[PDB]
């Protein structure tokens, strides 16, 4: 990602 | 090219200990949040939780929470899940998975066979009679699973591996072939029975009777 | 734990039709967020799972415009238009709104085609088997379909109903047949009493029975 990490940081 | 190869079957007996690997390939590792989930005949799936791949901790669903250990090895992108004290019903085919919005990439799966039960090895029989079909009967072994191929994986088509069936006899399944009826028994037909639990496996040659 | 339920059970389409495949969750799967992580996946037999549609109704790349999915809050569906032959496997519903993350019990889409008549070959007991003391007499029935398909044994005429072990494939991915394999299974000193092994198969695409047999 672009994100992700469980839902953003 | 973005890949996640999960490492081989194993077979254990209750109380030992298992490690199974997960290498990912083709992105930066440390970027996606990685799952691990167990697949079985009778539950179908379930997460069992998931490792943040950047900051290294680990998320464990509670039926997880105890003998399970989610860790990573950065440099070799890979992840690992242990699982300590094992038992039977951790028999199942295990994956990892990398998330970001979505399982966009799964990994290979890795099948967990957890038995106390007495391994034994596979009986191998051979199933002579345009096109002929032949086969193998394998019975008698203990526990699944038996892999089987024909001409070691290069006759693939026209292939009917039937699933097995344990019963009194354990183990039973059968293995058919069809091939052009002008080229056997000139061009050789042979099925191999692999049975990884007694580190076995089994060549027959299909001859006409 | 978000409960995801699924229907149908098992989904038999023509090539061609529409394939509606529901799920229902226990409770709200939209996320704090106000997304809804809802996704279906596809696993076909030996095979790793495949991510199909994601936040309910985006497909995902290389997927084909057949699929799309709708739905919101605890009832989804995902609809495949003009199904095809490799369509086939079972579906599963998926939330990741939730912990722990949840998946449906999966629906199995069975794809309806053309009737075909079974292959049928029959085998008689190896050396080897006898060797050891039994015999087993196997006969394949390949490539038919419909799936439903009645075999009945016979030794020297009479109807045999010990001993037979069952055995059936998933449909196949490419003609979307099934193939069965039949296996009767004696000991040798039975085997050895007896002349005639016949296998025969009751199917739709014959009027009378598909009759195979091996004499000893």
């Known amino acids: 990602x672009x994100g992700x990490x469980x839902x953003x940081x | 090219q973005i890949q996640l190869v999960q490492s081989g079957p194993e077979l254990k007996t209750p109380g030992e200990t298992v490690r199974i690997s997960c290498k990912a390939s083709?992105?930066?590792?440390?970027?996606?949040?990685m799952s691990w989930v167990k697949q079985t005949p009778g539950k179908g799936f379930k997460w069992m939780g998931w490792?943040?791949?950047?900051?290294?901790?680990?998320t464990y669903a509670d039926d997880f929470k105890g003998r399970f250990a989610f860790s990573l090895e950065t440099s070799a992108s890979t992840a690992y899940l242990q699982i300590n004290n094992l038992k039977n019903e951790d028999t199942a085919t295990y994956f990892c998975a990398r998330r970001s919005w979505y399982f966009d990439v799964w990994g290979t799966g890795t099948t967990v066979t957890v038995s106390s039960a007495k391994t034994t090895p596979p009986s191998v029989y051979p199933l002579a009679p345009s096109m002929v079909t032949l086969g193998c009967l394998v019975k008698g072994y203990f526990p699944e699973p038996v892999t089987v191929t024909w001409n070691s994986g290069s006759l693939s088509s026209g292939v009917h591996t039937f699933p097995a069936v344990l019963q009194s006899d354990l183990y039973t399944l059968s293995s058919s072939v069809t091939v052009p009826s002008s080229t056997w028994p000139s061009q050789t037909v042979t099925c191999n029975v692999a049975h990884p639990a007694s580190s076995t496996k089994v060549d027959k040659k299909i001859v006409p009777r | 734990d978000v409960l995801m339920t699924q229907t149908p059970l098992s989904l038999p389409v023509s090539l061609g039709d529409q394939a509606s495949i529901s799920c229902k969750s226990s409770?709200?799967?939209?996320?704090?967020?106000?997304?809804?992580?809802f996704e279906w996946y596809l696993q076909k037999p030996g095979q790793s799972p495949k991510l199909l549609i994601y936040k309910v109704s985006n497909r995902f790349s290389g997927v084909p415009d057949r699929f799309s999915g709708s739905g919101s809050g605890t009832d989804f569906t995902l609809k495949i238009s003009r199904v095809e032959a490799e369509d086939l496997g079972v579906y599963y519903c998926?939330?990741?709104?939730?912990?722990?993350?949840?998946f449906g019990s999966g629906t199995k889409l069975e794809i309806k085609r053309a009737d075909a008549a079974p292959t049928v070959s029959i085998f008689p007991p190896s050396s080897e088997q006898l060797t050891s003391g039994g015999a087993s007499v196997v006969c394949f029935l390949n490539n038919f379909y419909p799936k439903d398909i009645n075999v009945k044994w016979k030794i020297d005429g009479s109807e045999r109903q010990n001993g037979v072990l069952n055995s059936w494939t998933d449909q196949d991915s490419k003609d979307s047949t099934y193939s069965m394999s039949s296996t009767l299974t004696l000991t040798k000193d039975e085997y050895e009493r007896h002349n005639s092994y016949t296998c025969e198969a009751t199917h739709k695409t014959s009027t009378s029975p598909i009759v195979k047999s091996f004499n000893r």
């Open positions: 409770q709200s799967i939209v996320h704090s967020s106000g997304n809804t992580y």
């Open positions: 998926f939330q990741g709104s939730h912990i722990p993350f949840t």
């Open positions: 490792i943040n791949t950047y900051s290294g901790v680990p």
């Open positions: 083709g992105y930066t590792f440390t970027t996606y949040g």
